[PDB]
Amino acid sequence: SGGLMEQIQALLAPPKTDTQHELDHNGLVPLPVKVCFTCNRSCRVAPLIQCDYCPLLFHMDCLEPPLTAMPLGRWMCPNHIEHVVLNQKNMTLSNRCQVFDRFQDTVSQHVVKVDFLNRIHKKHPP
Amino acid sequence: TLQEFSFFDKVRRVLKSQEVYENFLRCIALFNQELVSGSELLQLVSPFLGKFPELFAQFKSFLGCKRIGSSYRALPKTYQQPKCSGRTAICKEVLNDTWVSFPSWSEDSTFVSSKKTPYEEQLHRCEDERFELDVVLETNLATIRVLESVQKKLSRMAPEDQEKFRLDDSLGGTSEVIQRRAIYRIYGDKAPEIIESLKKNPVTAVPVVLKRLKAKEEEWREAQQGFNKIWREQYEKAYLKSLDHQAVNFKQNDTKALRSKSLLNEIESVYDEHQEQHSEGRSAPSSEPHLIFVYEDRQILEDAAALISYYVKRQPAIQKEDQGTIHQLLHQFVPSLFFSQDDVYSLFFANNNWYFFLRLHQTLCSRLLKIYRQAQKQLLEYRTEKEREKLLCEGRRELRLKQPSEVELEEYYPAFLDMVRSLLEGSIDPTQYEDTLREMFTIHAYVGFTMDKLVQNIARQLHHLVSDDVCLKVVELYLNEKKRGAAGGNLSSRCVRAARETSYQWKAERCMADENCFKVMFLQRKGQVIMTIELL
Amino acid sequence: GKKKVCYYYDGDIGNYYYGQGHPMKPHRIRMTHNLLLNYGLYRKMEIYRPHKATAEEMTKYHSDEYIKFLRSIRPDNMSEYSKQMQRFNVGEDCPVFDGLFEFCQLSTGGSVAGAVKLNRQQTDMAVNWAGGLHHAKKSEASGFCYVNDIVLAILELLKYHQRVLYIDIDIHHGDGVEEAFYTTDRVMTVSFHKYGEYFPGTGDLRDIGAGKGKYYAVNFPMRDGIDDESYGQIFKPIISKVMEMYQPSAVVLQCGADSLSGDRLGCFNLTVKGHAKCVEVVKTFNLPLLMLGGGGYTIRNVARCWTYETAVALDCEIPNELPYNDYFEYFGPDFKLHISPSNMTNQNTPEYMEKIKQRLFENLRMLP
Ligand SMILES: [Ca+2]
Ligand SMILES: [Ca+2]
Ligand SMILES: [Zn+2]
Ligand SMILES: [Zn+2]
Ligand SMILES: [Zn+2]
């Protein structure tokens, strides 16, 4: 580790005075596989990023617009609804969360949602 | 009606999950509460159904302080903007006043081990070391020149005026700092007294300062000559290794990437992806191969065969009968499979071992071709550069090292093959082999760093390809079926013989019913051979 | 054709010392000049001595308080300005060294004199390698820069030119210049830079301007290891589209060399030829052009790059063999003008570049 810096600084001195969607440890595509939502390909082509709200894996290039770097924090996939809620940026996250939880207790609602769909679907309004 | 039920059936089938489907239902319900317009509704549903044109068309028919950007914040309105005295009309009308960006990081960050090799850091340290000495030397020399100029000016005027000459804190130069910096460096703590003497009485004080500066300049110059001698052969030992960013990673990554389990996984994953696509019913034809590789030269083929034969002929555990058998397999059967003995294809049904051998052989051939192309490019670039630099008037358009001759440049590739043979025999050390490769092919040399092991791997496959009755039965079945012409043939006659080909596949299924079965197609086109492998 | 260019160099710029171990070294300019002398490029070029810029000239963009602090601070009175030193971000990253105000004066004066020369139409090309400090803000120092001379040069250019186009090929994002002209349509700033856990942390794809200056600021974020082919493939079409939509009258080109391979702080994989291809492409459009320096922290590569671009701007061809000069031993062991790249992985895949280019094209089509 012989560097010349000490000798030069002495020579010039002044006089002064006195998890599952990743490659294995050895490196292998885990099986069974989970694929990107846009291309249906695994982590072998490119690393996959996992949305932390829904189980949708994505590729950094398969997005629109593509991500330039890895998202360090919690990332939101483009397949959710809070994006249209983000159109109005004045309101804080607590009101948004309470609005979402207004529909978080009857999550199925399948009969009523198909019913509302056909109710709107009628071309001539009632 | 039932059409809506069928639509919802196919959408929850295609989404393959309940959470994404429920998000879609939340979207349509939020629409149903009259908070969403039709165009906004389709722009929200586009992420879910952007890859099914049929589903999207069906859904369309069924329907019938402020912040901007990502890094700019608005300044407070009641914020005392710092006054400026030079603001002209263009300054007021043009300059930004309301938005600010906040720098999030700092330069000279933790980048020491982020992406750089250990041999770039030595070069950086040597460069810095050079710069510190050079900057001190050039400050001293500039001060010497300034004092020489002021002394020459002083010596030309009347003696009764010399005692009336004085100097300011620029000390005759154009800078108020640099000359004082040099004098401070020379004199340590006694610098202010010398500076006052130079400013007050230049006539008597200039020559002694000049003498001291000159003596220090000579001593520093000889020390720098010694340091220049030492700094060399560190650039030489570090330069080529600094540009090769992959060797350390590549050696281990390749020593793993060639294992049988890794090769098997590389195709099993693709098979699983295609199976999932078929399950989701996406528009993908059920005849495409899972993996595709290209052979672009026959000369590379016989070169690789010669290398493998060279290694196998020097084996102690392989008997003369097995040597002959491997010779027939390598120089006769394989070229026949590649049709060395358009739109002409060959069909082959193989087990795991033949798939491994084909993968390894393709890897070796591709690397040999890469080295060959690099050598050709180097020779062409050298010839073009010589032709260009011969015709140069340079500035009229208003030691070193001796580069190799053209003959060495065209003999690089046979020398590379001889080097590979020497490494395989064990006569040359891996370190010297790697160094010669790096000096021969610069940053494309790593491609050949782990060739011998690769060859070794291939050899093992060949040996097993003789000892396992399954493999010889496979090649015999291929030969017997080709005698009928069903396995492989002209592209047009496929539909003529297709049923017969089916029979062949059937036999494969009843010969390896406990083992993976691979369909391999060798398609010839324009001098290249495309090997397409698919797992059954 | 062959045209008259102006060169600005002050012999004292190489002596200013940033500090021990600091990546920023003005010495590079000196070596660059030395190379220009040993290729015989002084005969076809006009060399000027830049006049020092008065503080009144600098206060056209910077506040008087920040300039007064810069003119007053010295290494021997750091104790009496500590609070101010915290306020203006003068400290660790941007240190206070001996004669920093004179350094700022020379660097600013070179580019301001070049801009004045271009305004007077006495030339259509001015070169100042001491300039190119684009990270400095209105009342703070950032990214080794204390005074933003690019903004001052553009403010000088705006007195005769209606539209001024600024191009930045330094690996970092030129946040100071972009922020200075964020809400105006008379200056459009194109920046190509690395993005993501990198200084200064700005310059997103969606930073397109504000107010009247909307769609007049374009950023191309990149990944590690971009090389000559990708850079050439995405620089020429974007610049052609920018010049066809915007139709500028003057061009300011920041030629920072920290985007070359082997840089002490950069991550890219460009070479000298690929770097100067941008200069050739810009020069093709035949506009009053001001070329500036900037970053670059592998000193020998900076010298090579800037001497090659100076040769290219003169339409002069120079041999690949480096002539003997005062700093010859810096260029071992090959002693060649051109440099070789590494084999680092190019993380910018073709689909990423195509998508970003398409987004930029759709952003550009919206200009009037
Ligand atoms: Ca940039
Ligand atoms: Ca603008
Ligand atoms: Zn994908
Ligand atoms: Zn999601
Ligand atoms: Zn930079």
Residue numbers in the entry:
A (entry chain C): 17 to 34, 257 to 364
B (entry chain A): 304 to 367, 394 to 670, 737 to 793, 802 to 939
C (entry chain B): 8 to 375
Paper text:
Histone deacetylase complexes remove histone acetylation, thereby repressing transcription and regulating the transcriptional output of each gene. In order to address this, we reconstituted a recombinant version of the human SIN3B complex, composed of the subunits SIN3B isoform 2, HDAC2 (hereafter named HDAC for simplicity), PHF12 and MORF4L1, expressed in the baculovirus/insect cell system. Remarkably, SIN3B encircles the deacetylase and contacts its allosteric basic patch thereby stimulating catalysis.
Moreover, we obtained an additional map of the catalytic SIN3B core subcomplex (SIN3Bcore) at the resolution of 2.8 Å. SIN3Bcore cryo-EM density map at 2.8 Å resolution is shown for relevant sidechains and water molecules. SIN3B Glu436 enters the active site and its carboxyl group establishes hydrogen bonds with the catalytic HDAC His179, whereas the Cβ and Cγ of Glu436 makes non-polar contacts with HDAC Phe206. 16, we could also find an acetate molecule coordinating with the catalytic zinc cation and the catalytic Tyr304. This suggests that our SIN3B apo structure represents a post-hydrolysis state of the deacetylation reaction where the protein substrate has been released and the gate loop has returned to a conformation in which it occludes the active site. This interaction is dominated by a triad of SIN3B acidic residues coming from the stalk region of the HID i.e., Glu456, Asp457 and Glu461.
